[PDB]
């Protein structure tokens, strides 16, 4: 298991524009296109992302390209954020993947708001971190996914994805 496979499991793969859990236009492997309720807008942003007139549909290849860009961007975002970096560098490989997942889902800012859990993770207080993180809108809104990521932080293993 790696970051790609993990996110591919949590986000799925859809070749046509669809709405995510929050109702936002998305495509591919969890690639948010726009928060706007306008489908046209979504179509616009998609073409601009791909570089061609897609008419709301892309190929697998194209979905994977977006995914590579998105993961790269997520990691780079972590390293550039003064609140996230230290945490990330303190972790082992597996747990780092859990942190990337959260950032991919919620954005850096969103993750950066988990102050207390981040501190706990930095202190390697696994269980405490797991219980604090569950007290969130994130956990209540997408609990199965959140449970998988939380378990990952908790154990440092991929058991939740097997
Ligand atoms: Cl809560
Ligand atoms: Cl979920």
UniProtKB/Swiss-Prot annotation:
Outcome of substituting residue 26 to E: Complete loss of activity at neutral pH; covalently bound substrate
Annotated phenotype, changing residue 11 to A/F/H/M/N: Complete loss of enzymatic activity
Location in the cell: Host cytoplasm
Catalytic activity from the UniProt record: Hydrolysis of (1->4)-beta-linkages between N-acetylmuramic acid and N-acetyl-D-glucosamine residues in a peptidoglycan and between N-acetyl-D-glucosamine residues in chitodextrins
Result for mutant: residue 30 to F: Almost complete loss of enzymatic activity. The enzyme is destabilized by 1.5 kcal/mol
Annotated positions binding substrate: 32, 104, 117, 132
Recorded family membership: Belongs to the glycosyl hydrolase 24 family.
Protein name as annotated: Endolysin
Species for this entry: Enterobacteria phage T4
Taxonomic classification: Viruses, Duplodnaviria, Heunggongvirae, Uroviricota, Caudoviricetes
Chain's gene name: E
